[PDB]
Amino acid sequence: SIIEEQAKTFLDKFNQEAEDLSYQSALASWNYNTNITEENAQKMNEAAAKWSAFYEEQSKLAKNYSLQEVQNLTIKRQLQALQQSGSSALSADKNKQLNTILNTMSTIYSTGKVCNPKNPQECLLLEPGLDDIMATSTDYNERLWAWEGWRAEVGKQLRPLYEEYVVLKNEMARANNYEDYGDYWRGDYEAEGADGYNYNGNQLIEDVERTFKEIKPLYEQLHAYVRTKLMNTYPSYISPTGCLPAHLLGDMWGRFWTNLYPLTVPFGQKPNIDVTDAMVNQGWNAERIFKEAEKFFVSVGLPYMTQGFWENSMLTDPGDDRKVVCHPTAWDLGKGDFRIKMCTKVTMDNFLTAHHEMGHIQYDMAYATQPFLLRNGANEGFHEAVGEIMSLSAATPEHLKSIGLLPSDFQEDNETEINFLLKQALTIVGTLPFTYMLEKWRWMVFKGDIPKEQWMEKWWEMKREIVGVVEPLPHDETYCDPAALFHVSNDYSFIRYYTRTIYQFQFQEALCQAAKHDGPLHKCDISNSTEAGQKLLNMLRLGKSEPWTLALENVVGARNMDVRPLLNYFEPLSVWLKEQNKNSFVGWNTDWSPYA
């Protein structure tokens, strides 16, 4: 118990310095992200360099403590968080090589351009370009060439870079008691504590498989219905028993199916609920939306908003000689400072992204009492999971007519629910197989089970075996299809969007059960419910102080992930889809390709 005292008296000084340094860095960043100029960028760089150097030096200094003689778990987690900094634990030349490889990969991805094969002088980019042509166009050959050109001009350049990047990342990973750049990523899903509460990185690879195996049939039903509906547009290319081509899924990669709604409306003879004219004619400004969100949040027992929030937050575009970065975000400046940056228009999607950001801000406000190296989420998916349930809650017609946006005599019909459920499904359940595939492929490439020869042949068979998507043209071992994605070529993990989707419906079901709500789960509103807010606040009061198993149990009472709430949310849609698919084939075969 002699190292205990030394660690305790060192963490205090570390916290005292880190608070000020982080506040300076965050303030510089916020100042740049509103009044963009060259001096502001210089100030950002000079503020961030000092914080990075201080953090690295403090980690190196603390690397003379040992986790085995520390029995208090409160400071053991802090020491583990501070010591785990194995990004510079490599030779300088190798580090410079790695950085230049990331830089050149990013430049190739951003600068990449493809040209019209019939009009040479028109060449397009991704953001003002190919993305729009996939979102809107319908012609088969147009989508085909736009897909193939991007695949052939990104992969050809990013193949050897990725090939020689894998070995460098494995070398970096096998210096922190890790076997590859796999387990290193999975190490966030780590917990320690009482009996039955531990969670290592090898259980995630089984929990994910179990959850996907339970999920699959609903995706099969949705895929069969989409395949049956997608024959009045291309009645010469779709096989009733086969799969779906990759260049017809409303997106460049197939990440989201939300762009297939106009071609797959269940009942197209009635518009969906879009309350925008109601706010336009009632005289609503940017501040009223945030006041309504504040009222909704205080209704459930959560605290008010800080006075400085209403003065230091840019809730609308200045509309002058001040160009800004217009992207919604929530900031935690530190030292009790909370701000929200977002361009606000009088429209419904802004009305929802305001609730999302205020949920983030409340979650940040909750754990301000914890030590410095404990103020974060719990499983890298809790933030957006907490922030996205408010969007679901504040979109029910009952909530809309309870605030003065719908007539009091509005009677909700039944045909609209099928449309809304299908629209939600095309975004929620139509992306899980893609995420599971991408993450498993990356893991098994990093481990070494895929050699260089099977690098691009396993991918284009796992896709048809899991997702149900086949390529329109054959691809040899000179392409790099996964590299043509932002999250793959920019070192971003790809399990958050699966884990968040799993937790969201568990949280929603627990909160709705606490509120004593009868009826379907998709018409639930947690307003005027103090017990639900109390349970949520009891959850979001710890941060990283306790293992995330306790955080999950504080709300749902479960020790691990569960998918039954997700299926319960989509019961009427499943019944309707089963009723519609009486004279159609449900599954698919993997021995069909539109080039043989």
């Binding site: 005292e5 030394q6 008296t9 060192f10 205090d12 000084k13 005292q16 608070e19 000020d20 506040y23 303030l27 200094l61 003379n64 800080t306 006075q307 400085g308 230091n312 400046l333 030292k335 009790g336 400072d337």
Partner: protein, 194 residues
């Protein structure tokens, strides 16, 4: 007749640090406290032992005034039977206290853009404070078995840390000014009343 110099304590331009808080004696000085009570300027006026309403009849020999500046979330530590960083190494009150404290915000007169690092507070010390004691020492704190040699390094720290007051921080981080009044009934004749 004489008034009493409470305007040189509450209305002073410069206050002292927590580890070097000033102390002032009240002489044979006719004082009034209801004027202090009926002023909507203090965020904390709670009195232990005596009641503020019937505080113009009691007579005392000497009255002590102590002043310093602390953070917003540290006023609760200026109270008998309290434990924390402030009331263990900087300023500690006894359990038989018979006076009371005054606190109010000082953000506008104490915060500057970029940081005001003129206020410092003790962070490391061996023993407790032995209430109503001050210590002004810059000796290097020794944590490990290896002795320090007047230089900062491993397990050797400087036991002084400065505040980071800024005009944008939250209420729990805005600076607060604290004035503590203590009354003693000595064996000398009660010299002044209200």
């Amino acid at each position: 007749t004489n008034l009493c110099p409470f305007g040189e304590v509450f209305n002073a331009t410069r206050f002292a640090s927590v580890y070097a808080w000033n102390r002032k004696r009240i002489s044979n000085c006719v004082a009034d406290y209801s004027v202090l009570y009926n002023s909507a300027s203090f965020s904390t006026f709670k009195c232990y032992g005596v009641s503020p309403t019937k505080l113009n009849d009691l007579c005392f020999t000497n009255v002590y005034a102590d002043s310093f500046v602390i953070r917003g979330d540290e006023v609760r530590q200026i109270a008998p039977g309290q434990t924390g960083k402030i009331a263990d190494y900087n300023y500690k009150l006894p359990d038989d206290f018979t006076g009371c404290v005054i606190a109010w915000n000082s953000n506008n007169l104490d915060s500057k853009v970029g940081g005001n690092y003129n206020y410092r507070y003790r962070l490391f010390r061996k023993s407790n404070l032995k209430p109503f004691e001050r210590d002004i020492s810059t000796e290097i704190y020794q944590a490990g078995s290896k002795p320090c040699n007047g230089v900062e390094g491993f397990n050797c720290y400087f036991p002084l840390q400065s505040y980071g007051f800024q005009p944008t921080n939250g209420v729990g981080y805005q600076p607060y000014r604290v004035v503590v009044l203590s009354f003693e009934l000595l064996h000398a004749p009660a010299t002044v009343c209200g």
